[PDB]
Design a protein around this ligand. Sequence first.
Ligand SMILES: CCCCC/C=C/C/C=C\CCCCCCCC(=O)OC[C@H](COP(=O)([O-])OCC[N+](C)(C)C)OC(=O)CCCCCCC/C=C\C/C=C/CCCCC
Ligand SMILES: CCCCC/C=C/C/C=C\CCCCCCCC(=O)OC[C@H](COP(=O)([O-])OCC[N+](C)(C)C)OC(=O)CCCCCCC/C=C\C/C=C/CCCCC
Ligand SMILES: O=C(O)Cc1c[nH]c2ccccc12
Ligand SMILES: O=C(O)Cc1c[nH]c2ccccc12
Lengths: 327, 327
Amino acid sequence: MGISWLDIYHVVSATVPLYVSMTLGFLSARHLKLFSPEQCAGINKFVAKFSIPLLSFQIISENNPFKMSPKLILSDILQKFLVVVVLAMVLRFWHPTGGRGGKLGWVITGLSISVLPNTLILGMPILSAIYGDEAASILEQIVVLQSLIWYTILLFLFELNAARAGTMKILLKAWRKLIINPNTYATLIGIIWATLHFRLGWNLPEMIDKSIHLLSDGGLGMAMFSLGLFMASQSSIIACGTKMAIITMLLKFVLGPALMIASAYCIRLKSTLFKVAILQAALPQGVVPFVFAKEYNLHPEIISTGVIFGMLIALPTTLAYYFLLDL
Amino acid sequence: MGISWLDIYHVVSATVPLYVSMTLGFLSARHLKLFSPEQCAGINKFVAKFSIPLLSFQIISENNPFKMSPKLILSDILQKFLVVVVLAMVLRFWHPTGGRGGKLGWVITGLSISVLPNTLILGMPILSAIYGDEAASILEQIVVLQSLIWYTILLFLFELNAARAGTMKILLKAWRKLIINPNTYATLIGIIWATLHFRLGWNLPEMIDKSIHLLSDGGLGMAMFSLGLFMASQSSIIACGTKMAIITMLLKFVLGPALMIASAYCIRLKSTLFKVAILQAALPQGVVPFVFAKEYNLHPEIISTGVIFGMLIALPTTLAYYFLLDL
Ligand SMILES: CCCCC/C=C/C/C=C\CCCCCCCC(=O)OC[C@H](COP(=O)([O-])OCC[N+](C)(C)C)OC(=O)CCCCCCC/C=C\C/C=C/CCCCC
Ligand SMILES: CCCCC/C=C/C/C=C\CCCCCCCC(=O)OC[C@H](COP(=O)([O-])OCC[N+](C)(C)C)OC(=O)CCCCCCC/C=C\C/C=C/CCCCC
Ligand SMILES: O=C(O)Cc1c[nH]c2ccccc12
Ligand SMILES: O=C(O)Cc1c[nH]c2ccccc12
């Protein structure tokens, strides 16, 4: 059959390595009292400045920009626009935190959750197993687009919000803060090198590949360690409160995938493309958005509980959507 | 015909990644002003507490305790004893930094220099190329013994010195500081697991293997990053000064290899064992001892200027010793 206990074991064995790093970081920050808050911030700074850029480059460079399916990109952009419209409309009617002011900061922490699943680590063992090798290849384009356009746009939104804390000058300041970022350079060099490699066949030198790998290899372990450190910093696992936690998880696991269903139907995705493009949306929050929020101090307590409690519901949620799509 | 420009290229391409990580760390600490001294200390603390133990375990577990050559272990112990004796005799007459006290710290640094080469990363490309695949296994045994006994003894000496800043009480305090050290637990679990794996055939579960790898993969990149950060902290690249730099370089690249030659001759190592055991000592200083010194703030200035300017002389030094041994 499509689903088996062997698939469940592969999914669980893919997830547990992340929770081991998370728990080690949390214990080292809280129980073992190893890293002071400044040192935890320094570890997260290293992760955001040297481990994510050096892995965004690896993701983007190892995809052919010319074979990316236009339908998938159109569907993803349509999802993102629909989610942005819905979130903006909702805030006008009721703002969170007791109906106070401020659209950005929430229109950013809602896009960090709703429209940025975890695909590289957990999406593969789940969906490639459920739907075979085709799902892996289809989701590879989604992951590369995520690292290519969406993280850069999210960083621009973060820095625009930071600047906002005299209308074109703010945008210019946001742009200037963007250019000096290492993520933008990582993605630009990644796309340029993907072009060169897949057009002129310029294989990256082994020396440079090894030098990049030395720093990028531990990126995921360090990122989950940083999430654990922050968890230790926060008083409770559900640091945003139950109500906000309910709304955050609802946005992540119902609205995001439902709007992806709407987008896939609108773009007329056929057969596996329609099915594999929506089960990807209903996936854990990820820890790149968490890294950005923690560095920018933009309501990371919402991202934390989402990451911790969504890697337990990604598998059941994908099973539920797969059963729903069967008939 | 034993040495070729292709060998030089492999050695250089194995060394360059470490210098890339080092330079990135140094720039990030000095020119880019990213990590404050506290954050640099936090990154180094993470490296010492999570990256080295999780790699000492990987090194020790993958060895076969029942296939270690007794002659190699005896030769290594004899070299270490001869060194310790020579350093103690020298410290009696002339003390470093003029005539002062502090024998234990200076002998600890002298041992960290003379009797702890770099074999895992640079020894394999260099001596395996010079002497073929035969030297690979012998150097592997040297590396396993290094991670098994010598690093633990070095940590005990470091903590004894720290506790000395009422004779059996100090030793007991050193032991208590040792037991809580993550490195000793990593080495003990590693040796026990190697015993289990190579005696009863137990295989480490895939889940646990991936959990360990997530954190241990970036260990070397982060270690070189930390060394670069410390370099940025120091006023000049030759932090200890020329005279002390001359004495440190001499201790590492003449006394160490010379005493290893004496030890190999005494133990009657035959043919490749005699040659491979002495060309390994004349190798860079390594960055595990630097990590320990930086954590314990015990003259890391003398280790940084070796880890740099020794990875340039490791290749010519190996060529020189190989030529000397030919006739
Ligand atoms: C054949 C070759 C193929 C390509 C090989 C590519 C390999 C590498 C791939 C991707 C890039 C990985 C980057 C990882 C390290 C990033 C470190 C970094 O830079 O951290 C951002 C840094 C900090 O900025 P801040 O404002 O936070 O702090 C400033 C504070 N205070 C105002 C007080 C000074 O940024 C600054 O300093 C601003 C200055 C620029 C920062 C970015 C420098 C690195 C990026 C591009 C330049 C060249 C790279 C390699 C060669 C490419 C091809 C020519
Ligand atoms: C089939 C299975 C095969 C085996 C699989 C195992 C793989 C693991 C391999 C190697 C170990 C890697 C350890 C890496 C993390 C180490 C972190 C750590 O521990 O950092 C040292 C920590 C801090 O000490 P501190 O004094 O610096 O600060 C205390 C300050 N203040 C007094 C204020 C509280 O130490 C303390 O807290 C002291 C307490 C002990 C610290 C060490 C804990 C980890 C080691 C062993 C325990 C169990 C391990 C796993 C199971 C093994 C098999 C049964
Ligand atoms: O889930 C992923 O896409 C992997 C991932 C998330 N944040 C990271 C930070 C550093 C290295 C890898 C990752
Ligand atoms: O043995 C080596 O040269 C590799 C090495 C030195 N220090 C380290 C710290 C963390 C991970 C690997 C290493």
